[PDB]
């Protein structure tokens, strides 16, 4: 009905290796590493071809972010695992789960945030003195949407590409009902 498919900006994925790593050695022998114990208890590294950032902990846990697609995230995680293997630590690809999906879109018209906050008061939370965007907590699917006056919608919380599309399709009518002028 809407005719516009929201585009996924970010992908947060989690992977495990099952082996203990030496952060000092990884930092010294890695091209792009940032090991600051005072700052954080993990090594921050980044790769360019996928344009992604990975946080690697001493417990063998890796958190990949920045991927624009599920297969791109898979490729980035595989390359990270290969980099660690080349470093020498016993790292094997294991459970890779996407824990967060972020998407964006625009409805191409202004939206009455006060009207939405009054009509749908069980799901919306509008406090314009802190953030200039209404927060809508859709219950099914369980997702959080940020609605702005400029007609831009940000979706976050989905674990799969289906949930975010379903949420946008379910929120489009109530958004259209509250168009300014």
């Amino acid at each position: 009905t809407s005719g516009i498919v929201p585009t996924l900006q970010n992908i947060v994925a989690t992977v495990t290796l099952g082996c203990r790593l030496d952060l000092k050695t990884v930092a010294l022998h890695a091209r792009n590493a940032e090991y600051n114990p005072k700052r954080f208890a993990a090594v921050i590294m980044r790769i360019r071809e996928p344009k992604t950032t990975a946080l690697i902990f001493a417990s063998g846990k890796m958190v990949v972010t920045g991927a624009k697609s599920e297969d791109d995230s898979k490729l980035a995680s595989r390359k990270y695992a290969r980099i660690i293997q080349k470093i020498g630590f016993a790292a094997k690809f294991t459970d890779f789960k996407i824990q967060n999906i972020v998407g964006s879109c625009d409805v191409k018209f202004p939206i009455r945030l006060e009207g939405l906050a009054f009509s749908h008061g069980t799901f919306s939370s509008y406090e314009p003195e802190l953030f200039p965007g209404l927060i809508y907590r859709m219950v099914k699917p369980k997702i959080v949407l940020l609605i702005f006056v400029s007609g831009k919608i940000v979706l976050t919380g989905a674990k799969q590409r289906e949930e975010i599309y379903q949420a946008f399709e379910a929120i489009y009518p109530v958004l259209s009902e509250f168009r300014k002028m």
């Binding site: 022998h29 470093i87 020498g88 630590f89």
Partner: peptide, 10 residues
Amino acid sequence: KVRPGSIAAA
């Protein structure tokens, strides 16, 4: 045992 004779081993 994690590192077979590698740079990590050194």
